């Protein structure tokens, strides 16, 4: 079938990402046009109901070619209201969702380390989906896992022993970032600058502070759940299998 491999780029979503539509099925696809070779290499192993999709990858030269899934939705971040953030029942959908893609990541050893709202995507039917690949890296191979040393992420979101180890679990890292997102669902704002001791805000959380924002504009339900991710040791962190037990993950909402 003629033209059925055309594709036009129709606008700039995000090197660059272009929403790009076939000539011919008028099919909507992301195309990321550009570290690379490692990101295409880990969306090659990918295939969950929560990760954007990965169809194929080509080289024009200089240029890479990545195509992807398109979120008609948008960014999560897009549905933070600045200082609200959301009713509680689609922040808890989202926080459902954001968890069984990332139970699958963890699940075939690969940690995402830059989860944020920018990153987590909506469909048409505003399913979650994570994104952006670019920082990931695998942390268990033949069943062996690897500690990781490498300072990645975004400061708001990255967990404290990241700054103060050498060496820390890939996992608990990405358990602290989904309850970052959590707070930020369920506040429309992100609880400190970085988790140090030096933030006083932070500072403020470890003496259990709820009384402050962001954490007196968040119910007691989800903010049990908080105080179970948000723990500075990440030995003693709340571990998805756990999360999945707690009272609020499994409270009827609507
Ligand atoms: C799965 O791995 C990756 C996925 C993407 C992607 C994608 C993507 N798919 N669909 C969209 C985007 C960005 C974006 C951004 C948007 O707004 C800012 C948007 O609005 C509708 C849609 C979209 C990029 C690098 C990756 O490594």
Request: glycine share 6%; charged share 30%; net charge negative.
């Amino acid at each position: 079938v003629p033209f059925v491999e055309d594709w036009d780029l129709v606008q700039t979503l995000g090197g660059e990402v272009q929403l790009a539509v076939n000539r011919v099925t008028e099919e909507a696809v992301a195309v990321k046009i550009v570290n690379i070779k490692k990101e295409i290499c880990i969306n090659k192993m990918l295939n969950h109901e929560n990760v954007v999709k990965f169809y194929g990858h080509r080289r024009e030269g200089n240029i890479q070619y990545l195509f992807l899934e398109y979120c008609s939705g948008g960014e999560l971040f897009d549905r933070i209201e600045p200082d609200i953030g959301m009713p509680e029942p689609d922040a808890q959908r989202f926080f459902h969702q954001l968890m069984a893609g990332v139970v699958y990541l963890h699940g075939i050893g690969i940690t995402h380390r830059d989860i944020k709202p920018e990153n987590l995507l909506l469909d048409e039917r505003d399913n979650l989906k994570i994104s952006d690949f670019g920082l990931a890296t695998v942390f268990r191979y033949n069943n062996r896992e690897r500690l990781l040393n490498k300072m990645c992420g975004t400061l708001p979101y990255v967990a404290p022993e990241l700054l103060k180890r050498r060496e820390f679990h890939a996992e608990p890292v990405d358990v602290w970032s989904c309850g970052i997102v959590l707070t930020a669902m369920l506040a429309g704002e992100l609880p400190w600058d970085q988790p140090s001791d030096s933030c006083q805000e932070y500072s403020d959380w470890k003496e259990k502070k709820t009384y402050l924002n962001p954490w007196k504009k968040i119910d007691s339900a989800p903010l049990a759940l908080l105080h179970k991710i948000l723990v500075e040791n990440p030995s003693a962190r709340i571990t998805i299998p756990d999360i999945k037990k707690d009272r609020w993950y499994n409270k009827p909402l609507k």
